[PDB]
Ligand binder design. Structure first.
Ligand code: F0Y
Ligand code: F0Y
Ligand code: F0Y
Ligand code: F0Y
Ligand code: F0Y
Ligand code: F0Y
Lengths: 158, 158, 160, 160, 158, 160
């Protein structure tokens, strides 16, 4: 059984994240979608809300498990018996930062392999931050989010 | 009548911004310089101060109108009957972020066309943030700002 | 304002990415010159006559586009055509760096010519005439990336 | 899942950077095809027969690697080999831009082939076969960057 | 006597910073390692703590002087009689920002020359921010910091 | 400290951007070697004898510059010249990526040679000898970017 972990803040999970986790499930037997509590980033949604939204949005994928965590990434990957860490590519700044995290994780857990996937062109210019900024100014973001997430975001801002 | 909108936080408007709006007035019949309230960025100058400084700095250009806004960018462009959105180029991080905003705006208002202009080499390495950081440590920033803006910045920090 | 804009390139061959950029340019300027380089440094796959005829047929539906071959310095041709706007597409970071170096050079050569950068549809962001030609030469499907007339001409060129 | 992955390139010659990437790929996929381009656009320093034999000897210790020459479009070969994973190494920003353009093209050509990007050790992040060959041609020491068999073959090639 | 200044926030000084200051001492007769108070960045360590840690970490290098400052960079360089400003290279975002600072400093002090050095591959993916993020989640950062700094960081988080 | 620095390149021809970098290097190091590559991969527009004479006349006002031709690996020449500092100019992001790959290679070849990167004036940030030559070949004005002697030599070369 090959196990992969797809970590992030997912505040909230977008169609870009759904695209990446879907591609990961086609490659690995079991995928853990791991949501960091991230209190320092002051998230819009609590960890419990982010886990519930991601569980609903990924329910149609049989080999995805959604979990919350506050541990060091490398420790949580070891403790989930995962040997693959999935990241999505986007911008240069993200890529250069992903290279720093991958080299750090290699020092913390040498057998944990960083794997980068490319999202569909459709979602290659979106992020949780951009969707929230548009929604805060009442712009239509229905195209970018799963249905349950779009309702939760509208309710949170209401 | 071809109408263009040049949006930003302009906190405060610099000679780099004057250069871009001047180039835009040579291309389009009417240019709206649109200042976002931007409370989340905690601006140094209030919106009323930023509008007044920009009005004084652009008074010599007959086809510029300075306006403040708190709306979604795409909605404000539609409501001003503009079909061109002017941006200035600077760094890679800015460019990659401009590409995300342009693709989002295309989803919100397909007929709104993002147009990128290049500032003079003279202003290609300045920003409102950099000028404010230098001024906060008493460095001479007279070369980078219109006269009225330089006086207002010195007064604000005094 | 009756603006004349120039959109220069080798267009070897013209792709849907080029059509996207020129269509956007016609929606903001009164007249657009699609300027095709006569003699690029590397021998083109299509001759200037073929490149011009392909671009003309592919832009015929846009009433304010003029397709014209040129052999001078791009800025010398733009000056003689009374163009005041120079159109270039920005696909990614590699485009951004190179285009900024050319724009500072063109501003030195012709200060009255303003460089305007447009963004193509996400559909054409990763394509270039070079990549399309390379894929087609190695027996890959490129139909989606080209106007029909160009697809037909490229198939005929690769058959021989 | 019994995944077949393809790691394509010119491998002219195979370096320790390539060995690093293929070793990581064998640690996550059941079978890895190290696919060597038969006829690149620029004449290679080593013939296809030399490139294949060097890569075979340098990967012989990895039981689930198969070294194979190919002349078709990379995606056409991957489809015929039943590969569902495409392996590429990402060294720096220049790699990132070019690889993203190729990945969108490969997804159009073969949607069932997923591009997976791996990162080499810091030890090999700045090297390429091109830089190694250029340094060695101008009498610089490149022993550290190559498997022993490749070091021997490169010295013999440069001696004549 | 050729004098160089190596400025930064050094919150805390890492092995990457030690590598850069060591390379600078091999090139220039006297190197001032200058620590900015940086209250706007809300540092983990006070300026007095950062100066003491850097003094201990660089004590083995005879031509390094550690000093704290709150002045404009260009003014502090002039006042130290330095004509060389040392920077370490890392990512594109850093490089583009270094180009803006270098062009600004050239306007403030034309004779002050910005010199960029490249750290060892060993430290090319680390930063003070990354080390602190790992340490805050109890990850082992002993490899990345001088001994005295590692003890101080563990004590600060305890 | 009596530092010897090396500033290598093809200098085909030397531009005001090169003069800017070498002038800054003379203001921080006791002796600067302006090292000109004898045999680059692509045939240069100017012969080594022409490149050397142009660089000598253009740097004659700087007393601590020595112009010297070299054909070895740059690091082998730097070692034999007792240089401990290697000077390179950083114009933009494309320069940054390539220069970092060369600096790690040079550190492996000659660990005692420290790579030092300088920034040119904003006036010369977008220029290269390649862009200047291309503009001049296509009848564009490049007088502003070159020392007077180079402007004269380039006009004479393009006239024939
Ligand atoms: C290769 O990918 C990654 O390595 N990471 C980093 C984690 C990140 C998710 C995240 C966000 C905010 C806080 C955390 C907290 C837990 C909480 N709450 N844990 C944590 N922080 C880290 C920072 C750096 C490194 C190397 N390890 C870390 N571990 C995690 C996804 C991408
Ligand atoms: C193509 O250019 C741009 O699209 N934008 C984005 C806006 C930005 C100005 C700005 C700053 C801070 C807040 C706002 C607020 C109003 C206030 N106060 N509106 C707003 N935020 C947005 C974020 C993303 C998008 C797609 N649309 C937005 N609309 C605007 C200039 C560059
Ligand atoms: C803003 O964009 C551009 O400026 N350029 C450059 C031109 C280039 C088209 C092209 C290709 C090959 C040869 C030429 C020849 C004509 C023929 N045959 N003229 C020409 N070469 C140049 C190289 C540099 C510069 C600044 N100006 C040039 N003018 C043109 C599109 C992108
Ligand atoms: C994801 O990576 C890649 O997609 N490619 C491209 C291939 C390349 C290896 C290579 C070199 C030279 C010629 C070929 C020839 C076969 C021979 N001989 N086939 C080939 N050329 C191509 C160019 C572009 C694309 C999308 N597909 C191609 N397929 C292959 C490694 C990196
Ligand atoms: C070429 O390098 C640099 O120029 N700088 C910039 C400084 C920076 C250190 C630093 C951090 C935080 C605050 C300061 C404060 C002092 C305190 N406390 N002074 C200060 N801020 C500045 C921002 C911009 C410029 C051009 N000059 C500045 N001078 C310094 C290292 C890299
Ligand atoms: C830090 O900068 C550089 O390292 N280089 C590389 C050299 C280059 C000048 C040059 C051009 C063409 C041929 C040579 C030939 C001599 C002749 N003729 N020597 C040479 N080639 C090399 C390629 C790579 C490396 C690492 N070392 C080399 N040494 C030199 C300036 C920028």
């Amino acid at each position: 059984q090959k196990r992969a972990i797809y970590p992030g803040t997912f505040d909230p999970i977008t169609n870009g994240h759904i695209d990446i986790v879907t591609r990961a499930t086609q490659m690995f037997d079991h995928v853990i979608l791991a949501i960091a509590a991230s209190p320092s980033k002051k998230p819009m949604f609590t960890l419990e809300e982010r886990v519930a939204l991601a569980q609903q949005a990924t329910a149609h994928l049989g080999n995805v498990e959604v979990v919350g965590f506050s541990d060091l990434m490398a420790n949580f990957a070891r403790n989930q018996h995962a040997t693959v860490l999935i990241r999505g590519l986007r911008a240069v700044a993200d890529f250069e930062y992903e290279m720093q995290l991958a080299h750090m994780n290699r020092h913390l857990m040498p057998e944990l392999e960083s794997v980068f996937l490319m999202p569909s062109k459709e979602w290659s210019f979106i992020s949780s931050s951009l969707v929230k900024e548009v929604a805060r100014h009442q712009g239509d973001v229905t195209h970018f989010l799963p249905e349950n997430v779009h309702q939760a975001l509208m309710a949170k801002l209401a």
